[model samples]
Target: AAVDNMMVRKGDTAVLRCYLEDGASKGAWLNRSSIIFAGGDKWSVDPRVSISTLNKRDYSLQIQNVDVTDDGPYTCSVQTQHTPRTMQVHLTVQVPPKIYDISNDMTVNEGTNVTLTCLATGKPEPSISWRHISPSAKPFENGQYLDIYGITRDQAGEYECSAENDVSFPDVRKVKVVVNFAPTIQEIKSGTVTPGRSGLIRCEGAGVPPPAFEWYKGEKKLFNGQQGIIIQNFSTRSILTVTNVTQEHFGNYTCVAANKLGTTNASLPLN
Candidate 1:
C-alpha cells in the first residue's frame, strides 16, 4: 500500500489516479471503506463518484464538485498474482474566505466606548483586520473585533474589515460610525472699526447637529433685525454684521453657539 496527498478547491473537480503493473489485475476504487467502483463496474450510489479512466494498467476515479465534507482518504486496491496492493490518497479541500454578521452602521455620543465585530469563516483559518477608511487613516486593529474607547467626532467615519486566506482573494466589508458632540466655538477674531462705518464679525463653530448661534452685546442679546445687527447662521458658522457702527457698538461682542449637547462661546472686542 502507498499513500499520497491531493489538494482541491471547493466546488472543483478532483481526480485520483491509481496505476497497476499488471494490465489484467483486478482492482476497485473506494472512498474510505465504501466501494465506488470495481473493475469498471459502479458500486457506490454517490452520483458524483465515477470511474474516469480504466485503460490497461491505468485506473482513475473522478469526483465532481468536491466539497469540504468530501475531504478525507480514498483507496484504490489492486489484486496482484499473490497479494493485494493499495494506494491511499489524502484529500484536502480549500475554502475561500467568507464574511458575515458584521456590525451595522452606528451612531454614538462623544466620549463613548464602541466595539465593531466582523465574523468570517473559511478553511485554512482566515485572518481578520480593521482599517480606518480615510485619506489620513491607517490600520488599527486585528482579529474578529475592534474596540474604540472615548470615541470622538474625529473618529467617526467609515471603518473597513478584511478577511483573508491563502485559498483566494481577501473579503472586505465596511461600517459607518457617526458621533454626536456639543459645539465648540472655534474662532472669533477681534476687529477695529471706525464709528459710523459698517463692520462685520464672524464666529465659527464646529459640532455635530450644527449648533445655533446667538449674539450678545454687553448684557443684551441681539437678534438678526435688531439695532443695526444682522446675524446669519449656518450649519457650523455664524456671521454678525453691525451696519452703521456706533459708539454703543464699540464694545465687546460675544457669539454663543449651542446644541442639545452643550454650549460654547467666544468674545471679541470691536473698537
Candidate 2:
C-alpha cells in the first residue's frame, strides 16, 4: 500500500481517495482505526465526514471544516478475491497563528524589572517577535517573553508583538508600559519687568502621568486672579503671569510639580 501525503488548511475541506478493482469484494475507510464508511453504508456519525464520490475508478472520502484534531492517518481498505489491499493518506492540517494571551498594560516605578509575555498557538509553530512602537522605535528580541531590567523612563511606551508561522497573516498585539518617577523640573529663565509692566514665568515638568503644578511666591501659595497673579496649567506645564508688575512682585517665585510618585520644585525670580 502506498501512503499519500496531503496538506490542507484549517477550516477547509480535505479529500482522500482509494482506487478499487473490478473484482473488489468490500471496501471501507478508517481513520485512527475507526470506521468512517463500509461498502455503501456510512459508519461515522460525524456530519462533516461523507463519501463524496464513489465510481468505478475510485472511492473518495471528504471531510469538511477540518481542524487540527483531524490531522493524522486515514486508511482505505479494500477486500478482493485475490488479496486484501489497503492505502493510506496522511493528512496534515495547517493552522494560522493565533495569539491567545498577552501581557496587559503595566505601570511600574523606575529601576524595576518588567517582563512581558505573548502566547500563541498554531501548526508548524508560531514565532513571536517584539518591537517598540513609540518614538525612536526599534526591533526587539524574538521570543514569547521580553525582559527589561531596571527600566528607565525613556523606555516607557507602547510595545507590540507579532506571531507568525508563514501559514497566513501574522497576529499582532500591543501593550503600554508606564514608568513612574518623581517629577523633574526643566530649567527656567528669570523674567525681568519694570513697574507698570507685565511678566510671565513658565515651568515645564516631565514625568509619567504628567504632573500637577502649584505656583508659590515666598511663603504664600499663589492662586489665579489673586493680586494680579494668573496661573494657567497645561498638561505638564504651568505658566504664571504677573499682570502690571510692581516692586512687590520682584521676589522669588517657586513652581512646584507633583504626582503620586513624588514632588519637585524649581525657583524662578522675577526681577
Candidate 3:
C-alpha cells in the first residue's frame, strides 16, 4: 500500500518506486516474469509515463513532462506463475496559475487622477501586489487592486505588479505613467532679415496646459498677440511681410507663449 500524500510540479519529471521484502525465497530469475503497472490506467508506455526495472531489487516508474492530469494513485503488481502481488502509491501534482495580458500605458495631467489596472490568471487564482520604482514613495500594499489620486510629475515612473500563489509559480507585469504639465521654453534664435530673403525662428515646449503665443518687435507687438506666427501656416516660402524691408523695422524680436502652468519665450534679431 502507498501513502496518499505526494507532491510534484507540472511539466517536470517524477519517479515512483515499488520495493518488495528481501530474502522471501523464489529469488531465481523466471523465464517469464512481468510486472503490471497502472498509472491512472489507460496505461501503456506513453511519453508522459515510463516503467523500468531498478537493479533486480526495485521496480521503478518514471513520468516525464508531468501535468495536472498526472496527479493520482499508481498501482504496481508482480505475477509469479500462480498468483499476483500488488502495491499502490498516490501522487499529488502542484501547479501555479497562469497570468495573461495586462492593460496599456496611461497618461494623466498634473493635479488629476489616474488609475492603473493589473489583470492576471492562474489555477489557484494568484495573489497580486503593486510596487513603485520611483524614489520617496511608500511601499505598495499586497492586494489585488491599487488606486492613485492627485497625480503629479513626481509620481511618474515605472510600476510593477507581482501575482503568485502557493501551488503555482509567480509572475510580474509592468506599466509606465507620464504626468503632464504646462510647457516650458527650451531655446531662442536670432538672425538678420532681408527683403528678398526670409528667416525662420521657432518656439518649442512640452505641456498639457497648452501655452498661447505672442510676438513682439522691440516694444511693438504683432500677430494680434496670437501664440503662433508665420506668413502662412504650411508654406515655408511665404514671408513675414516687412513691406519694403527697411533697417528701422529690423531690430530685436521676441515670441512668447503663456499658459496657466508656465511661460516660454523665443528671440530673433533683425538687421
Model 1 — which ten-residue stretch has the worst lDDT?
189-198
Quote model 1's TM-score: 0.88
How would the candidate models be sorted by lDDT, starting from the highest? 2, 1, 3
Compare the candidates by TM-score and give the number of the best one.
Answer: 1
Model 3 C-alpha lDDT per residue in residues 86-121, reported as the tens digit of each score: 556576666775546665677777888666777776
The TM-score values for the models, in the order shown, are 0.88, 0.78, 0.55
Task: Summarize candidate 2's per-residue lDDT along 91-127 as a digit string, tens digits.
Answer: 9999999999999998999989999999999898999
Top model by lDDT, which number?
2
lDDT of each: 0.87, 0.87, 0.60
Residue by residue across 8-124, what tens digits does model 1's lDDT show?
A: 889898989898757568779887888888887998787988877757777888999999998889999997887789999998999999897799998889999999999998898
lDDT of 2 at 165: 96
The candidate, 1 or 2, that scores higher on lDDT is 2
Looking at model 2, the pairs that clash are none
